[model samples]
Target: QVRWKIIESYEGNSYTFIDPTQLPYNEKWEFPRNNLQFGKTLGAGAFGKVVEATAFGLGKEDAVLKVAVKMLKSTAHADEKEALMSELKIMSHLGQHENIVNLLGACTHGGPVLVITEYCCYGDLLNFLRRKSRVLSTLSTRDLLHFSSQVAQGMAFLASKNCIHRDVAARNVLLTNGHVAKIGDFGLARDIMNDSNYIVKGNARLPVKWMAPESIFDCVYTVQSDVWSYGILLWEIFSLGLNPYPGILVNSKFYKLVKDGYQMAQPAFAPKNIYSIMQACWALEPTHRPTFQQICSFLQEQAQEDRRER
Candidate 1:
């Protein structure tokens, strides 16, 4: 009898281990280290750093592409590698979406694994917004709608794929040269099929200000909570990259206030209707929150109105 251990499931896709043979063939995902030349550093985190690089001929003869490479620290342990493998699998399954970052390939031939992805020319949405804040007067209502709509579309894609993006923030959304925003950073995302909320087992720190009440208290993460985080992302956008719950310490007092229904005040110049949408997303009850598709539809409607006014 073949022993198959079920690890996780989302929609109909299941992560099962039949044996060593069950591992997906990874030849297509691997790139030679020699063909990759490292460039400037892009960003950094606790586990690794992201850098710009140029990769040559992973597949085609004359293929030369600029890429963003996320490389783990040299002292990475087995657990980190396992996490990377999980992320790689999820990214592969995700394939290409208009509002999601594209994973080109990985360099696993030697040394620490480097995750290669499409380089966002304008960097992350957070930094982009911060810079644009200097010229905030130049932005139009349609501009804000465009950014929010793109993010909602990306989140809707994840929902359709049975995945939950536990971390939904402006910082994780990458901006291309054309100002198109793509959702990135899949390290905290998870596939949830049978269960609505995945009970977190560890003491992993979460983005406190961006978290839903349930996630903050019970460590239960779901697509619904992701909606809550999306609301915070909207706040960030409207405020031109200001921190959520500005001036409030992320201590017990902050939690109590949030539980008591305290929400950030609408940013200056924020339209009343858009602020109303943010409030809907912050509803204490998860079921009361709008689905990503609904949010996207509403933004589309609003955008059409904006165009009519112009």
Candidate 2:
């Protein structure tokens, strides 16, 4: 057993129990915290904070790469640490994809578990869309379609690999320099076959507003549940950062409302066809909702029409 100190400083802390040989992670994927110089903080969450950092090569011979490091506190519980490891494992398994954020490396230090990923210049989709709200009126339909389709394509890839992104929302998607969106934050992701489905068994809080009815009540999570969240993401895109179900409080009352078939109102300027897709995604039965492939096809078709019109 290791005695983990609760560190409150940014200084170099030492570990007495970490075994390098026991890590089992590939050398290329391991990054020593000593070799990293942290810069501005990108984002912060309950368990970790993402910061911009620069890393040196193996021998410190030269500056090598700029990365976004997700720093998880060393004092975390076994389950929280397992969740971080699980995120790394899933990211490693998926490898590289255009619409998926790539894990550059990781650091196991006495202070924190640093997960390094490719730096997304524009930050997350939620902040990006909100920041651009001033010029949202000028944002073309083609751009909206591009963002939504990119997410669907990424989710489709996850589904193909038997992975379910339990938290598929605009907040979890990151944007690169060209406003290119990539699916990110795999802490809630799970790998399961057709016969497997996750059911919440204990006191774990979930994003109630974005969850499917089955997920909300029975705690059942599957790829279809993710599709339900994707519908909420579409609402976020069209509304330009408006909260879903504005007036409804997110309590047991909220669950009852959705269980009774309460769907979000269409965003003021969303096209009818796009709104139709959103409604279809909110179908009471999980099997009744459109598959990611169908959703992607519909968005691509709409995108093509938008391009032809221009």
Candidate 3:
């Protein structure tokens, strides 16, 4: 009897298929493309371009927020797209910290994938420090010390989360209102590092300038490597954004120099205490390096002292 029914006309008996409720992005993190207007190009980096944007109706009725939107390299196909998705997931899990950049919603429904994050009024820390390098009124010695402490605080938080920031430099810091420093990274570019900041390794590109000796030779990445990078970042701060090796280029000789116990000279503006800490971070053995927690506490104590120095 069932065999006869199977042969019946297929027109009326076909069951309609309805799309499931599943969506690509979480509704909470999803943004409507129409709600955002892209403005000036903030920067056209290697992987993608960053653009300034204004968001509408984010918090309340007709509310607005200034945000930065990042467009990923269109060439990233299936694997790379998923790579970014996983990165976003990790970023969302990172939650909020005063010293780290905050992620806003994203416009991924149509057009190229766009990621939104809070915008910094003064822009990257490197440029800000560069512009204010010589001005007595721009930034005082005490203020520079405070900025260093804040960055260390952020690194400590990431360390607590068991996360590694492959790139830790002045350029990665964003200055928000009141000149507050926050770390920023868009998925496609950083991959736990910085943008347009890579060097061709044996095959893969590594941000060699900020890499630790162990990382350069062994291709190992860990919190210790990040701590080493923190030392380099400290130099950028004290040097007012000067490149680490002033006259040297990163090449075979540079690697040999590093292996031969070479390190950047004391920054002209570095306090003895601060330079001592930087040297500690440059220890060839990872075990010899101080944990971010240790660095944070030391800097916090320095910052907490009430006396001012210029």
Candidate 4:
């Protein structure tokens, strides 16, 4: 087990763990190199902005770093900053995994407080699907099942860690060098193991298309809500990488849609069984969504069946 350093005083709201492997040589350890600014700003987000930078310490120029710099415009981020700091502390203590995003380190001293991470070369899964859609033939069901299984494995690990990834979407999943799904964007995440009577109400925004109908209307979030998100994620994965709401013209807020029982229409290409699973996740009641463990079990069985057929 890796030694976990917990920073309990960041604030009453959050804590952090540090990982040397995810950090720059100078901060992670007593090492130095010509660390060049090798990343370009990918885009701006609500919590912070992201960049695609390179690692100069690894003696290579092609390293990718996804830096999530939190913007503390109010009160020096006394509370929010603590969360990021706590995240760092937790990340460092965790062991490396193929499915989890690598937490490099944080740039707290710089003008912009940045959380450094391994750059996902393929960018967001959303972009990947769009790219594939531009020039691809018919997508086979077998390929969709294969990708879905990988996502299940990653989710299972996070669940085992007592972590609930509030946001599980195409954009948050990164494809690593080994063709593995490295889940990213932990800013909106929380640990169920630590949640004690903390019924947080809309602490984060819900991506309506991928959100559970109940969560959108009732402000209820739980492991079941996560399952709902994963089901939508599966839809995104199966639709030849189609953009969420690629066809829907939605000016209404997501909450309104959920309150009105808005259900996402399955992309016609999606297979019936897979589509059924996705619908089960979107059931009007949050309790109806299948648990990640259940999803993992079902998918693994399907994979085994495919193997036998071949």
Candidate 5:
């Protein structure tokens, strides 16, 4: 039994966590940090809402702040609470990486858990790419290589730690200062630390199209699944953030695409070798997927080649 330090025991009575939706419409919620003034709404989901904010110079102005406030049911939802704590705990264990998103702090003093993180002024990678889609023709080959190599470096580091970011889609990749790439949204991230053979079942459904075939079918996943996912990410970045099952219900479309051996294609503007790497990543069988080491080597080769061309 893993014990979470945040919530301890209650004599003869287990605390029931309250759902965020059930909370009063407008109530003052106490938290560890105060970063409100919801300048703009970024997005929302079942768990919570994301709002774009600023420091007001009270803290750091150049650094944008994105606050994610997840809804909490009664104390019964220890699992949900544990997940939040787990994110912080894991992040603390693996502090600030150039690739991994920095966890600024969390507010656990109040009813709902409010997690604050560094905001990428450029927003999510997918959104950013979409904004620059039409201008793709202007980007030099060197620009493409620089961006992709950065992504590969980040993925290789995560893989080295024996961790698999189950959801490695472009939408989760955040960019700051127009050049740095940082992976975000650990909501769907799975740490493959142990072969416990017992997976703690959760309510959240996995994204089929971006997920590896094994994870889509057998509910099993590994670092290879992440490799496959990263391959899709590469395509997304190249395609200006296109999804495999675009314009369809994601769940069913994912099943059909995987079961039918359908492969995600590269965008028209994508470089030939880059597209080749994407195809290799989306191999039908997970065993055939390229390892992170292979990916690193491939990018390194390309970097060397690019230097020669220059």
Candidate 6:
């Protein structure tokens, strides 16, 4: 059976692994390293970094196309390489989709393997919304709602494949130049499925604010749990990227508050109907929450309707 497990080293480092064989992928996906040239850094986190790059010859229409390549640090260890390899294998199984950040190729032929994906010129949705906060008026209700549905479409696709994006939040959604939203990142993709209902503390940092009640308290993650996080993402969008749980401290107290039903108040400027959808996602019972497919159409109808006079 294909399963993922987080292995910890004596050095206090983690290396995640999965069965790549069960997740069949093309061997030809190994893009040649010689045809690629690295550029400036795009983003970085504890585990890895993403950088801009140009591919000399790729399948895309442009002979030379700008893309984003993700890999471990310059001084990666054996453990880190396995993390990236498992991520690469996991992504390989999730084929092409416009809503999800499409994997262009991987370069495991030499050095550390590189996971190449479509370049989102505007960067992540959270930072994009915050950077453009100065002129919030430029974003229409329909525009913001479209981003929600686009993510919903992608999440729906993932659910179809029995894939769960455990870490769903505004920070994980990338925005292209056209302002289209595409889901990215796989650090915690169904990470706890093979183990117990609880996620033992060791994998990575958890986003307490974006988590569902069950996730914050019990570490139980599911696609339904993902729906809860999507509501937080929606709150991020309508609030123009404001940090969640405004007055609450981000320590142990934060989890306690959410454990007792402390959903944030409706974001200002959010349409009444859209706020209702956010409420729906916070339903205490996991099964009670709207599925991604249901959320997709609900947002679609809201996006299609005329707003109440902005």
Question: Which stretch of 10 consecutive residues in model 5 shows the poorest summed lDDT?
Answer: 1-10
lDDT of 4 by residue, 209-292 (tens): 665655556655556777888887988887766656566644456457666766667776676777888888777777667867
Model 5, 159-244: lDDT tens digits are 55544566777767777776677775544222222312123335444555577777767866666777888887888777766765
Local distance difference test, per candidate?
0.76, 0.73, 0.73, 0.59, 0.60, 0.75
The per-residue C-alpha lDDT of model 4 at residue 40 equals 65
Per-model TM-score on C-alpha atoms: 0.85, 0.80, 0.84, 0.69, 0.70, 0.84
Q: List candidate 4 stretches off by more than 4 Å.
A: 1-36, 58-80, 93-95, 106-114, 136-139, 186-205, 243-262
Shift of residue 73 alpha carbon in model 5, Å: 8.9
Local accuracy of candidate 1 as per-residue lDDT tens digits, 1-310: 0001123343544332332224643768888888899999876644556788999885555389888887776656787676666566667766588898887888776777788888889877888888888872466778878999999998888776656787788877888867899887644222222222223235444567778999888867777888999999999999988988888777679879999999999987568888988999999999999999999998898899889988
The TM-score obtained by model 3 is 0.84
- Where is model 6 poorest over a 10-residue stretch in terms of lDDT? 1-10
TM-score of predicted structure 6: 0.84
Candidate 6 residue 203 Cα shift, in angstroms, is 7.3
Cα lDDT of model 6 by residue, 1-310, tens digit: 1122222223322222444534555666788878889999876654577888999888755478898888887667788777777777767766778898888888887766788888988877888888778862477787888899899999888776656677777877888878999986644322333423233356644666777888767767777888998999999999989988786777677667677777889998688898998999998899899989889888877865656534
Of the candidates numbered 2 and 6, which has the greater TM-score value? Answer: 6
> What's the ranking of the predictions by TM-score, best on top?
1, 6, 3, 2, 5, 4
Q: On a 0 to 100 scale, what is the lDDT of residue 291 in model 2?
A: 88
Candidate 6 residue spans exceeding 4 A from truth:
1-25, 60-62, 186-204, 307-310
**Compared with the true structure, what per-residue lDDT tens digits does model 3 show for residues 1-310?**
0000011122532232321112235657788888998899877644566788999976435469888887767665676565455555555655688888777877667777777888888888888888898665667667788788888888777765556677788877889998988885543433422443566655566667778998888866777888999999999999999977888888789889989878899998887888988999999999999988888888776665636431
Quality of model 4 by C-alpha lDDT: 0.59
